[PDB]
Amino acid sequence: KPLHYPPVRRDETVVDDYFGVKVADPYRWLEDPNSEETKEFVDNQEKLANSVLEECELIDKFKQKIIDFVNFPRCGVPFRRANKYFHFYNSGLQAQNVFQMQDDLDGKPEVLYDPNLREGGRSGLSLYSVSEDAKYFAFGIHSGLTEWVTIKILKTEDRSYLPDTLEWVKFSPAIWTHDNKGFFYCPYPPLKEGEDHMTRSAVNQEARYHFLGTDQSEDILLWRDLENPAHHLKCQITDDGKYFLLYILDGCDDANKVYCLDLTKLPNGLESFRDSAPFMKLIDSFDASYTAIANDGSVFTFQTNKDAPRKKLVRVDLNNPSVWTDLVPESKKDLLESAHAVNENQLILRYLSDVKHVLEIRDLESGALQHRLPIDIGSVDGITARRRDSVVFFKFTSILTPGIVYQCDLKNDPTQLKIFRESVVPDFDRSEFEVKQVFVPSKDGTKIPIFIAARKGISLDGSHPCEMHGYGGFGINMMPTFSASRIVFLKHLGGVFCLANIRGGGEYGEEWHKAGFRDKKQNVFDDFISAAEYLISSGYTKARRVAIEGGSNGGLLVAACINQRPDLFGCAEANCGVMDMLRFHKFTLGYLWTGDYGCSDKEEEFKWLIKYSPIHNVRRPWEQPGNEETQYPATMILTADHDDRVVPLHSFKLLATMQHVLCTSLEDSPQKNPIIARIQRKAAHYGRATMTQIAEVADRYGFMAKALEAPWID
Amino acid sequence: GFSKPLHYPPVRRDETVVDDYFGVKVADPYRWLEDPNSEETKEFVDNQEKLANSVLEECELIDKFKQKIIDFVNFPRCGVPFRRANKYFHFYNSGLQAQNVFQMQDDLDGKPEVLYDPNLREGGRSGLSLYSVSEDAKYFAFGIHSGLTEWVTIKILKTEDRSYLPDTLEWVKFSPAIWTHDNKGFFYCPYPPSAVNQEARYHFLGTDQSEDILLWRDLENPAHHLKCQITDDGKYFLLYILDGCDDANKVYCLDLTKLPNGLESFRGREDSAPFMKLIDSFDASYTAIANDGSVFTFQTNKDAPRKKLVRVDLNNPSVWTDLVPESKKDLLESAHAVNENQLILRYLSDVKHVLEIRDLESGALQHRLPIDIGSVDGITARRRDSVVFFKFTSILTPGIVYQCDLKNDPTQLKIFRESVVPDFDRSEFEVKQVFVPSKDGTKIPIFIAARKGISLDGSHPCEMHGYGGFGINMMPTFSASRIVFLKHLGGVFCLANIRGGGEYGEEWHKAGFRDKKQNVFDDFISAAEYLISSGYTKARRVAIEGGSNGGLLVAACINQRPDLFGCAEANCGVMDMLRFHKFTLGYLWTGDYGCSDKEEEFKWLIKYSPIHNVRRPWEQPGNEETQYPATMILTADHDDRVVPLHSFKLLATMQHVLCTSLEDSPQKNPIIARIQRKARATMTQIAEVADRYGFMAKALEAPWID
Ligand SMILES: C[As](C)(=O)[O-]
Numbered sequence A: 001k002p003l004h005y006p007p008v009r010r011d012e013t014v015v016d017d018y019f020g021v022k023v024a025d026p027y028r029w030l031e032d033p034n035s036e037e038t039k040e041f042v043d044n045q046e047k048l049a050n051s052v053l054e055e056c057e058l059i060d061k062f063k064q065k066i067i068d069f070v071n072f073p074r075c076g077v078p079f080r081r082a083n084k085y086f087h088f089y090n091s092g093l094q095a096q097n098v099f100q101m102q103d104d105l106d107g108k109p110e111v112l113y114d115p116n117l118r119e120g121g122r123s124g125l126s127l128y129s130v131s132e133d134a135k136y137f138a139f140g141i142h143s144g145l146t147e148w149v150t151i152k153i154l155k156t157e158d159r160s161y162l163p164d165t166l167e168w169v170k171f172s173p174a175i176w177t178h179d180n181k182g183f184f185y186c187p188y189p190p191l192k193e194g195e196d197h198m199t200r201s202a203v204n205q206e207a208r209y210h211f212l213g214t215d216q217s218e219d220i221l222l223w224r225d226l227e228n229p230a231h232h233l234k235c236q237i238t239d240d241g242k243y244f245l246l247y248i249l250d251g252c253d254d255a256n257k258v259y260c261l262d263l264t265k266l267p268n269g270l271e272s273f274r275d276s277a278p279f280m281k282l283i284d285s286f287d288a289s290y291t292a293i294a295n296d297g298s299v300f301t302f303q304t305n306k307d308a309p310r311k312k313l314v315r316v317d318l319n320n321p322s323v324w325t326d327l328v329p330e331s332k333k334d335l336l337e338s339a340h341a342v343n344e345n346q347l348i349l350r351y352l353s354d355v356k357h358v359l360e361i362r363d364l365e366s367g368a369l370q371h372r373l374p375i376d377i378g379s380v381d382g383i384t385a386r387r388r389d390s391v392v393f394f395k396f397t398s399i400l401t402p403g404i405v406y407q408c409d410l411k412n413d414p415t416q417l418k419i420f421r422e423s424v425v426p427d428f429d430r431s432e433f434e435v436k437q438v439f440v441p442s443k444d445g446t447k448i449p450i451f452i453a454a455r456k457g458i459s460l461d462g463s464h465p466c467e468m469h470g471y472g473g474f475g476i477n478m479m480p481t482f483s484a485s486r487i488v489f490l491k492h493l494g495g496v497f498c499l500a501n502i503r504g505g506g507e508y509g510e511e512w513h514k515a516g517f518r519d520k521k522q523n524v525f526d527d528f529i530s531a532a533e534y535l536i537s538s539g540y541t542k543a544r545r546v547a548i549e550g551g552s553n554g555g556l557l558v559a560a561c562i563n564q565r566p567d568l569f570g571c572a573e574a575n576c577g578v579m580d581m582l583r584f585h586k587f588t589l590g591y592l593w594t595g596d597y598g599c600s601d602k603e604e605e606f607k608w609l610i611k612y613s614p615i616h617n618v619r620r621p622w623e624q625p626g627n628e629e630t631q632y633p634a635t636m637i638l639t640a641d642h643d644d645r646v647v648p649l650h651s652f653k654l655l656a657t658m659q660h661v662l663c664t665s666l667e668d669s670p671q672k673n674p675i676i677a678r679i680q681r682k683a684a685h686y687g688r689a690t691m692t693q694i695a696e697v698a699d700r701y702g703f704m705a706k707a708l709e710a711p712w713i714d
Numbered sequence B: 001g002f003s004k005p006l007h008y009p010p011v012r013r014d015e016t017v018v019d020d021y022f023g024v025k026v027a028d029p030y031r032w033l034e035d036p037n038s039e040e041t042k043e044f045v046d047n048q049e050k051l052a053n054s055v056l057e058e059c060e061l062i063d064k065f066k067q068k069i070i071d072f073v074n075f076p077r078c079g080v081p082f083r084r085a086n087k088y089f090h091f092y093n094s095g096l097q098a099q100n101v102f103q104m105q106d107d108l109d110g111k112p113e114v115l116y117d118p119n120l121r122e123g124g125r126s127g128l129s130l131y132s133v134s135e136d137a138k139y140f141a142f143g144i145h146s147g148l149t150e151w152v153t154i155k156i157l158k159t160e161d162r163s164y165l166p167d168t169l170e171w172v173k174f175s176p177a178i179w180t181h182d183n184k185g186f187f188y189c190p191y192p193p194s195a196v197n198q199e200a201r202y203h204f205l206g207t208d209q210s211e212d213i214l215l216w217r218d219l220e221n222p223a224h225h226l227k228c229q230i231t232d233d234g235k236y237f238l239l240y241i242l243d244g245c246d247d248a249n250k251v252y253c254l255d256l257t258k259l260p261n262g263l264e265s266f267r268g269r270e271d272s273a274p275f276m277k278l279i280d281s282f283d284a285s286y287t288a289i290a291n292d293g294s295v296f297t298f299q300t301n302k303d304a305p306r307k308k309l310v311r312v313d314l315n316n317p318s319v320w321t322d323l324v325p326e327s328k329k330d331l332l333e334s335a336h337a338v339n340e341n342q343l344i345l346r347y348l349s350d351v352k353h354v355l356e357i358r359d360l361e362s363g364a365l366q367h368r369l370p371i372d373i374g375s376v377d378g379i380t381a382r383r384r385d386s387v388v389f390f391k392f393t394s395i396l397t398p399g400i401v402y403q404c405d406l407k408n409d410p411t412q413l414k415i416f417r418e419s420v421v422p423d424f425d426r427s428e429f430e431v432k433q434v435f436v437p438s439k440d441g442t443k444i445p446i447f448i449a450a451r452k453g454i455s456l457d458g459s460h461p462c463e464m465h466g467y468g469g470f471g472i473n474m475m476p477t478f479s480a481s482r483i484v485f486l487k488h489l490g491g492v493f494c495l496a497n498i499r500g501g502g503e504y505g506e507e508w509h510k511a512g513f514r515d516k517k518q519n520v521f522d523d524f525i526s527a528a529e530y531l532i533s534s535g536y537t538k539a540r541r542v543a544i545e546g547g548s549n550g551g552l553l554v555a556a557c558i559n560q561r562p563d564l565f566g567c568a569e570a571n572c573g574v575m576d577m578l579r580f581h582k583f584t585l586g587y588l589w590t591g592d593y594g595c596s597d598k599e600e601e602f603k604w605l606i607k608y609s610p611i612h613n614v615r616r617p618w619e620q621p622g623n624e625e626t627q628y629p630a631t632m633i634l635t636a637d638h639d640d641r642v643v644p645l646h647s648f649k650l651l652a653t654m655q656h657v658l659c660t661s662l663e664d665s666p667q668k669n670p671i672i673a674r675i676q677r678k679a680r681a682t683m684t685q686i687a688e689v690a691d692r693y694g695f696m697a698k699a700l701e702a703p704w705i706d
């Protein structure tokens, strides 16, 4: 059916000079989220979207089949405080997960906090910190539509609220001191009047200590740096309770400083401060990443990438800090992803080996190997066991494995794994499908690992719809994990799924990351294109039956790839993508990503950014000689109206630009395939209700089945 | 409402089939549809499913209804707890679980744990039918539907560790499991290894069903059916015998203390046990409420349409005394012995509940809590219990489980659990009661729910519900669907308490049954006329809905007054009144309908029988512009309760008479069937109600409001 693309005003005033190169930005006005015109733009694109989505008949069958496939209990990985175990639970279709509590392992669960009983379950919990004595539960809620968090505190004895209320938190955890008196957290300064969380670029993050029973204005300032407003914070406390550790970060880089405060050495408590705090600055530069794993007095075991792309464990005494020793040296082939001190004197290491996990248990003091459990295609994650804990829990998942919380009692039954909880998916035969790993040459010959999931014994004749996922940035490892949606794609649309472990990720250590960032960011798109070409050439699928999907930096990936190779894809779905690479740093926490992208402030970096910036590279493919029959694929640009993480102007400005260049700028365009935006109302980036999510994925796959001309199978 | 033209599928007519009802010839050309398992009947089901799906695709609002119902229903719901030993047991549902989970806890303060989760068995297609916890709280007997039929299989669980006993008891329908105080076993009432010759059995734990002791059966009266009970002191097994659907029963008492050995006393045959037959006729209803030795307190309707409590000693059984005598205006609906020496009575007073606490021995009134527009239900407290629980609900009140500690703080009510519905402002709506004159002048109570301060200008869609039979009281209770109708379709709801029900006792029942069954339809029509004349709605913005006997109500009313309605939705209706008694348990309903076996009864049945009164309204001389309303006939493909031939034969007959029998019919409004396959689960229900209201919004031309 023909589309009626709504009028979007162009402003030819807006020209900007990037080192002599003139760049026109006619949809500058869309950067204002709260204007008459921008709200009418959102309204118009919602109408256009709803008109196209009404023609996608399969949305309703997807939605009902997702709802059924997802209606099973899901369990979070439990953690211990005192004799209490706490975990997240969801019976299957509850809008938000419920936080549960129990006395010891045998104990029966009870509800500690149910977000479904507050504001109808629109917001779930972001922060969830139980104190050392298990008497206090600090928890974070989204008080507005943005993802900014309000810390509140509860007595676990009887669910009664404390008066304490702490605003202006984002990703900070609440780190309790062993005296149960309060906790360290890392807030931003308050909003002055006029300001908004969508329009303010939050800087000058602080390290605070909050005492229980006080107003936030009484919280003790430990650190801040007004001379470096972009520097951001993470923090931690050692398991013995003696050291507060402050990690300072430059941007999105896997690198940090390490500042240690000895809590035993302060006369008059943390009330001592009122003057910044006497940190021992063990690392005062951004050369390498460092994460404390354990300590015995001043003798610290860190995970690091210092002269070690695949990471390693090292030891240092804060009284003799120039002398560092390798405890567990760098592997020659496999990434040390995480390390966790457990069972007093043991050490669990998670290794990533060709995108498959291997768990090692080692002696803490010596570093000697004891056991080694390789794990199947899938992921192991969520190890939250502390050093004093003797039972270790982890979540396992894969493409065909819904989710198993495993349990290892290292003290009393060390070799066995017990299933704490196993989620079973209804109406799904896993043996009918298989998952293979395959390595594919890229444009420069680099072998890129690919996971391909499909029905066993499909003929490779290019008949099948193919859905391909990828990210390619920020050191993120992309693991094959369970999505119920995807099972519905595989089973009821005869689909083939592909997770491509492209460069920019951290799958083969920091060399893999740096091969797809800054000047070499193009390699990431080349890798993804090359993997799409393999699925076609090996015979799973064809040019116009391939669908690509991604979120945030993955949205950038999808937008970049369809600009460069529109012929290769039949559907493009970019979730909250970073589409204006010239101006991303100007909005919210976007300045943090300059470590991976560069910044248009510098001329060298502008020169590589301008070449792939999605909004600046939308070109009519049919106008290229010998490319006449090519058009852009059917495109859905997903975003929320109140995403403060990746601001929606990115998605809006791309959508406006595409709809102009391809459709409304000429009389009768070859562009037939729809170019729409699904804009979710009163949502943020993540943390949305179960049905809000299901509705979005239902629309995704319905649009996809229409674009790829894929029929339903009962 | 519906613009795109329909293609009604061919349905073969058989002019062989003529039947002689006392000289009056009656043709039944869709006789063949009575066979559910034929080539032709299965193709009929397939064709009407195509027609249905084609019409429903045009109903754009179905999807918005479905998502809004799902959201409005996704809140925790709690059932009324009951106590055994120090344990409390209740049904729970987090909101969209396919079936309710049975929970358990140690005392009132205690934290719930799951005792049985049906969602982990058979994917939650079947929930629990029976749920009997033993006296010591160690054993949980529970009923499942093993297959699509309504037959139940009793299974038994140890509550200590969830382990199953080997015991498996087939061939149960509605029977409960009544445990003896020795915890050794239980009385239940199965059918033999059709459904006639029901038996009263005792089952010992750890035995096969074939070893169960026979207490009673009557091969000379195969249609007589059974309920049973045990007294709170554990001493008396009571067997109630029933004639049909009528509110009357016998009362047989067995003294359990007088048996040498246990119930092994009857080990071998000795068919029938030595019951004291306190009532051996079907004159009145009797339900034991309490006893002190052989001195029994019964609820009854003996010379008492609105019911009363009476006392009798089994050693002096000819002497009956009124304990709480019949009220002159209000029905005694149920009575429960509580707190050792107290007695809680539920009265229905102009379709509103009034709870009275009285002294057991004397019958003296102590407290009296009238309750708001709504219902109170599920009082399961025993005599030895000091805390009483009940569930409250209304049109705008999702569900409150109340708690009354009669020992300490007897007058105050605590909220055990209150379900809160999301995205719903209750204060924006109101519910009024109004009494409306019927065709014979009788004042019929009506509940009307709507937005506060609507103008009465006939603009609003109106949905009207009713039943009218079998002594059933129709109470305004919570439906989340209905809130979506009121809020997002600007609707007006009406529950009409028509005759045939029991709302004003047995006089109300008998005024709408047999020869007087027409009064029920007249009452419903009269209430529809009031909503139009008072200005809530108009002729073609009124929708009527009902199930089973309520389906009969809807089909009867649209035949008689098609001009008055814009949408008709009849769920599992009884549509062939000449032949209903021939199928499954349909013979039971002859008490309320009559039977075409007898000539007087045929004469009133033929006048309203839905299948035999489908007439082209436009052919009537004043009535040219009238057509039948948009009609959805709801049914399941293997409903054994109200067999689907009723719905199929009506649908066939309507589609012929109104549409396919003439060149270019004035009948534009669609006449379809929504046939549910193999069915029940939360989503299956939500899908059905989504289709109901989507079709309705299309028929009534009602727009959506955000
Ligand atoms: C939120 As991002 C640009 O690190 O994927």
Ligand SMILES: C[As](C)(=O)[O-]
Residues within 6 Å of the ligand: B470, B547, B548, B549, B550, B574, B589, B641, B642
């Ligand atoms: C609900 As009925 C007694 O008409 O089957």
